[PDB]
């Protein structure tokens, strides 16, 4: 319950525009803990399975080639309702709909360059975590401030 | 008209997690003027009178003992709608409903660990102010910017 | 593309300069993805403010608004980007800071309606009128931003 | 006994009026030191004169007392290893024109007569100043959750 | 007085503008306690820069410096206060960003010397030469900060 | 060339538990350096030994390996002109008491036994450690879009 995990990935425009540290900071100060972290240049084959739900969409080719044109920061975060609250912290998928104070609302403009991706559901979280991370690369530890975050 | 006061308290999980300065900062940059500030470990008796409207709730015992298990920072802020807008700045009482940009929305997760308390009304404010503070501990002064914060 | 070149006029009111919010104000517009086209430091005359606020000359606060806008220096800015008029309003917040949400410029830094530190063009033609009013075409600097291909698709 | 040394930190009236209170506490909190005492107060010229008793012969003594009395102060007591020494380093030089960027004074003030913050110059100056503004009641003892990550 | 009003000329270079460091630089001078007197956004010409760097015409990097300062728009600013020429130079950092200390402007956002984001008047005399060069007397705004009596005794 | 030099920067277990990861990365990003390698790992007691092989004859070597092993670390590789030397300056002195405000250790830690972050002391140390924590596959080469504004 207090160990739910979600997949968060900083897109190539986030790395290029230098927003990797700020994004990691909003999740740290919130109270979530990092379980996995890697710096990687994804293959278009990997992205196709990650975006297999959108293969019918007209933007699919441009989305896969944009996600491949640069490195990404693949993370795994853990905490009570990390999937949902993470989506709230991220904002709406279109930055034009995001409210200020959200990651997209403070840092990006266009839908095709929305700097960050969050797992839309627990089922989408477990599918994406097992896709980008192996079980070895996920680190298990207890934050020194757990008893001050949860009861 | 601009002299209304509210009671703001940083809960024991807000002191332990190093969130005291940032919390005071949001009320300083907002345009509010600090009137009372103290550092205190509230006795269970001082808390039960503060939470007397919640004595019939099942969590009342765990709420008092958690608020007593650590020191709190008790503050009094004055300004136009410092009670109401203070509730807005704090956000919703359960952090899972709070919006990003609010204090709880940026820094905490669970309801029982929401780092901060605010007065819910002008009637709650007066009672809470007169309960934790004596009339002398309250400092009355004029901010050098009040002609730029108010007209 | 030609839509990504949309422009808006953002002014930092005298209370925003006095309370030292100019750099933080420009920071939210820089970190968002928008580009600086014009920037000047000015003391607007009452005559200049009246034409800028001509659609409020019937309101009772008009005289108090113009003199307060003239009682100090302002920071006139022009910004460009996709929906810079509409999203700038969002980042600014609601005109009354008691309505603004935390995270907005007005929600985070100001209290009273008469001292809401910042102005934003409400529409594209209000932006078109306000940019041509405070800026001459010479004062506007068009440059390609080094991260443009990472802001846009 | 060194992971318990306390120092007295005071935010001057100009530090409050300009709204640097949370910013000052933030640097002490993130540094690793623990907040032991806190109070908001408009100092009387009596306690000021005992606080600055070492400067009674200096020409600025009168203007310093009435300035520190012209507004409210935030009186703080911080605990940690060498909090008296590294507290002075964090503060910067007493003349803000001598403070280095990154310090509280080097970042936030200009003139020496308005240097927003005061630091205890020594452990003996601290315990005198601690006993001056703070009674042993108003000092809170507790263990921070990250102490074992701050100390060995 | 006169000392409580000395002016310097701090310029944000094109790499500071391109990398989104305009708001951060203004915020540091604001929170220091200095008074914004003038501010302009400008693509300065090769000729304006030659006179600005006239004491460096006999240096091999002089031609690549003027073309880099012309390759983008700059933020020209004027700040007023006590010892703001000197203190501003300490805030900027050392001109070689590898010598600038952390906490300075160049120590925090700069690596190479040919890309040192910002310039500061080295002396009061260089200030009054540079200020009169980039700005006209009209564009300089004199006003009284609301916190002056808490910055100066 | 010298715009491509790399260094090895690790965030110790106390830097992670006290939530400093995003801040440490942000200071390197805003400086202008490029992120080359990034991983999150619980280093084994065999890995930090060869990392701290020069300190095996120091009395603290035992408590340092097991402290480095007591939590997860964030191993990083950064590339830029003089990133090894300028990395050390940004970190500050190894003894946080000697670190200057504005550095990572002058802002965020107190004790030598808990200085949150590590930096490569030299180019040859950097290349020895980069090949110790990272394999050539995990290092991502990409041209930062603002390169022509960071370097001339
Ligand atoms: O419109 P919307 O409902 O806000 O977008 P959706 O949630 O359906 O998009 C799901 C995915 O498709 C992407 N997508 C949607 N529209 C896109 C477009 N026009 N171009 C590129 N990608 C797009 C989204 O970025 C999202 O990926 P993400 O999880 O990394 O943000
Ligand atoms: C919406 C509702 C259903 C739930 O919201 P709620 O969190 O329980 O109610 P509140 O937000 O007003 O709680 C206020 C305080 O109680 C605490 N609290 C509330 N629920 C808590 C819980 N489940 N566990 C621990 N603390 C809780 C909160 O920490 C909060 O702290 P605060 O001083 O900072 O404000 C609420 O309206 C409700 O409970 N109504 C019925 C209350 C009632 O009938 N009381 C009579 C006796 S049962
Ligand atoms: C919202 C509206 C309907 C009137 O509501 P309102 O309470 O006046 O709030 P507004 O949105 O008009 O605020 C406009 C400005 O008037 C000023 N203002 C508003 N209320 C004020 C008050 N009580 N005292 C002083 N100034 C006030 C503010 O400065 C405000 O923000 P700005 O300076 O950044 O522009 C207004 O949009 C309106 O009058 N529309 C009709 C004509 C028009 O303005 N059209 C817009 C162009 S399409
Ligand atoms: O010599 P110094 O610059 O004063 O530094 P010291 O360490 O000796 O401190 C002596 C006191 O004299 C104070 N002082 C020096 N000049 C002063 C002035 N013109 N007005 C008020 N106080 C002054 C200093 O502020 C310092 O007090 P502080 O620690 O509260 O700032
Ligand atoms: C030669 C003279 C200028 C003294 O040298 P100096 O006092 O060391 O000059 P500075 O320390 O202020 O720095 C030299 C200027 O040329 C720039 N510069 C120096 N070396 C440079 C290089 N290798 N590439 C590009 N620019 C360089 C510096 O950035 C600085 O300009 P800036 O303030 O806009 O950043 C002397 O003629 C005089 O002052 N009169
Ligand atoms: C390491 C050495 C330089 C002296 O150490 P120093 O003066 O304290 O400063 P340094 O930064 O250079 O190295 C100190 C290391 O020892 C650790 N250390 C020192 N004292 C410690 C203590 N009491 N407890 C825990 N760790 C300690 C430090 O944590 C640091 O490791 P870190 O980077 O993770 O923080 C010395 O032992 C030496 O000569 N080493 C040779 C290795 C080298 O640098 N070769 C370069 C060839 S070009």
Author numbering:
A (entry chain A), B (entry chain C): 2 to 152
C (entry chain B), E (entry chain E): 0 to 152
D (entry chain F), F (entry chain D): 1 to 152
Copy text verbatim from the article accompanying this structure deposition.
In mammals, the most abundant and best-studied NDPKs are NME1 and NME2 (hereafter abbreviated NME1/2), which are closely related isoforms (88% sequence identity) with similar functional attributes and localization in the cytosol and nucleus. Briefly, each NME1 subunit within the D3-symmetric hexamer comprises an antiparallel four-stranded β sheet flanked on either side by a layer of helices. In this study, we showed that NME1 binds AcCoA and CoA with similar affinity via a binding mode distinct from that of canonical ADP and ATP substrates and critically dependent on the CoA 3′ phosphate group.
CoA and SucCoA bind to this site via their common nucleotide moiety, the only part of these ligands specifically recognized by NME1. NME1 recognizes the 3′ phosphate group that distinguishes CoA from ADP with high specificity via five direct and two water-mediated H bonds. Compared to ADP, the α and β phosphates of CoA are displaced upward and are solvent accessible, pointing out of the pocket to direct the CoA pantetheine end away from the protein surface. Arg58 forms a salt bridge with the CoA α phosphate in a subset of NME1 subunits. Since the latter affinity has not been previously quantified, we analyzed the NME1:CoA interaction by isothermal titration calorimetry (ITC).
